[PDB]
From Swiss-Prot:
Species assigned in the record: Homo sapiens (Human)
Tissue: Ubiquitously expressed but most abundant in heart and skeletal muscle. Also expressed in the skin, in keratinocytes (at protein level).
Localisation per UniProt entry: Nucleus; Cytoplasm, Cytoskeleton, Microtubule organizing center, Centrosome; Cytoplasm
Gene that this sequence comes from: KAT2B
Domain of life: Eukaryota
Annotated protein name in UniProt: Histone acetyltransferase KAT2B
Disease: Defects in KAT2B has been found in a patient with isolated coloboma, a defect of the eye characterized by the absence of ocular structures due to abnormal morphogenesis of the optic cup and stalk, and the fusion of the fetal fissure (optic fissure). Isolated colobomas may be associated with an abnormally small eye (microphthalmia) or small cornea.
Length: 106
């Protein structure tokens, strides 16, 4: 399947990015005590990798939703000038450039 191959490529490029490090695994409670009382829909790149493997991403829309959720969680939780927020905006720019380069559409 060509969608799977394209999404796998985009996701791995995102994961290899220097600004992806905060988003690689679920936020640990020890890193942010009470995070899971605040953030209703946690998401991270490890979870997305498994979802990709399990053939969840049958559309661009589903893939976009999860990656975008990584960023919105980060911006909802963290101050605008925090390193985490800064990484989210850098990685989001990159993400959208990868979507465009792949020609990924609905
Ligand atoms: C390691 N990533 C983390 C850690 N703490 N918080 C609050 C975050 O939002 C993220 Cl992405």
């Amino acid at each position: 399947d060509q969608l799977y191959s394209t999404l796998k490529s985009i996701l791995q490029q995102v994961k290899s990015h220097q600004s992806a490090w905060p988003f690689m695994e679920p936020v640990k409670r020890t890193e942010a005590p009470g995070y899971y009382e605040v953030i209703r829909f946690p998401m991270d790149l490890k979870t997305m990798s498994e979802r990709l493997k399990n053939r969840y991403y049958v559309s661009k829309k589903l893939f976009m939703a999860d990656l975008q959720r990584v960023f919105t969680n980060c911006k909802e939780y963290n101050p605008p000038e925090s390193e985490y927020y800064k990484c989210a905006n850098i990685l989001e720019k990159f993400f959208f450039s990868k979507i465009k380069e792949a020609g990924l559409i609905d």
